[PDB]
């Protein structure tokens, strides 16, 4: 997941499930995976891992929703963060209004004399190349 | 990332042009040509990382490119760097490789114009330079 090999990471997760070590995939390891995936800007696969975590029986507390809401607000997507707020309210998690700062990357926003000289240089070459070449 | 070092090169582009040695066996040193901005450590680490040479020492020298002048018209070749690489163990070059036979025949064309004792060494190192 640090090398952004998300499909191979998911396959390794399933392979760990097949080997009988699925009980060691607790909420701490899944939160570490989410922190790694949000830290390298893979928010969609982070949501996929979050959905798999919810389907695995692991119960996300306030830290997982804090991380995901902060990453969604940093990417200037307040609607999805509010949607996760409503989902965490439905699940029964102690959640609060909070100011998450938006990243300053996703926030919305005559020919000169040397150029004339270069154009004339190009035209002078073009004139010389328009004639029949003398064989030699 | 940058935790590994300050100057980490993943795509090296150092040109190495081997000069043909005089002998085909017991090669303790050989010479190559490269660009003048190459250093001894760059040549050594490229030659041991990319080719697996057992490099003992690298000596370098700068040469001006060949020039021809006819009073206003001057044509020239690039300056280059010549590197002498001494090996920890001797190597050899196969006779049938192209173009070793042609090079040896041309070189011999341009040069046309028992009493051993006890404990006498037979294949000793022959290294030039300082």
């Amino acid at each position: 997941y640090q090398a952004a090999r998300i499909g191979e990471g998911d396959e390794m997760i399933d392979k760990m499930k097949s080997a009988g070590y699925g009980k060691a995939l607790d909420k701490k390891e899944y939160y570490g995976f989410l922190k790694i995936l949000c830290g390298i800007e893979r928010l969609e696969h982070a949501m996929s891992v979050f959905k798999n975590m919810k389907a695995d029986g692991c119960k996300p507390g306030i830290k997982t929703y804090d991380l995901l809401m902060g990453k969604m607000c940093a990417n200037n997507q307040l609607t999805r963060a509010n949607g996760l707020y409503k989902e965490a309210a439905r699940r029964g998690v102690a959640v609060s209004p909070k100011e998450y700062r938006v990243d300053p990357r996703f926030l919305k926003k005559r020919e000169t004399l040397p150029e004339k000289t270069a154009r004339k240089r190009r035209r002078l070459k073009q004139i010389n190349m328009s004639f029949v070449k003398k064989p030699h | 990332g940058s935790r590994l070092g300050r100057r980490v090169v993943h795509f090296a582009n150092l040109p190495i042009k081997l000069l043909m040695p005089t002998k085909l066996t017991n090669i303790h040193e050989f010479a190559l040509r490269t660009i003048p901005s190459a250093t001894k450590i760059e040549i050594k680490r490229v030659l041991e990382s990319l080719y697996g040479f057992e490099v003992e020492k690298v000596n370098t020298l700068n040469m001006d490119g060949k020039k021809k002048k006819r009073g206003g018209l001057l044509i020239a070749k690039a300056d280059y760097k010549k590197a002498y690489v001494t090996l920890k163990n001797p190597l050899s070059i196969s006779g049938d490789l192209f173009p070793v036979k042609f090079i040896e025949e041309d070189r011999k064309s341009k040069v046309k114009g028992k009493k051993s004792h006890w404990l006498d060494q037979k294949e000793r190192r022959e290294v030039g330079g300082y």
Binding site: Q2, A3, A4, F131, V132 | -
Partner: protein, 158 residues
């Protein structure tokens, strides 16, 4: 002594493989096929026509003797044969139903028929090799996709 201030012909209405008639010079009134076009001289070579005699001194590699070969003709000295009437004709530009440039016969006394692009043009002069060399990658290895941006397959070692 190439003394004229002659400009290059930029868009040629005279192509390799065309059937033409020489309309000027020593071989005036003779037909042939365009073997080769020399664009840098505004000249063409018609197969078997405009013959010269070269006194070539035989070295260690080639052979000596007096050889007969074609000399180039100026591109304004040949004219495309009308495919219906068989006479030399000028060439016009007609746009087809799809919108493709074709050559048509032009001039009073011409049929206006389409002058077809020669079939020899689609053939490679340097044919493709039959057997791959020892450093040539086979095409099945070239097409093996080891990178995928969606699933992150083939990422670097960051």
């Amino acid at each position: 002594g190439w003394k004229a201030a002659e400009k290059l012909i930029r868009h040629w209405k005279i192509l390799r493989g065309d059937n033409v008639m020489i309309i000027r010079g020593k071989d005036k009134g003779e037909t042939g096929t365009v073997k080769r076009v020399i664009r840098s001289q505004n000249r063409v070579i018609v197969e078997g026509k405009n013959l010269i005699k070269k006194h070539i001194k035989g070295g260690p590699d080639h052979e000596g003797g007096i050889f007969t070969v074609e000399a180039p003709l100026h591109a304004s000295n040949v004219q495309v044969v009308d495919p219906v009437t068989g006479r030399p004709c000028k060439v016009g530009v007609k746009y087809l139903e799809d919108g493709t440039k074709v050559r048509v016969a032009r001039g009073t006394g011409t049929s206006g028929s389409i002058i077809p692009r020669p079939e020899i043009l689609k053939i490679r002069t340097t044919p493709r090799p039959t057997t791959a060399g020892p450093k040539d990658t086979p095409m099945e290895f070239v097409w093996e996709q080891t990178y995928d941006a969606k699933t992150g397959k083939g990422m670097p070692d960051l």
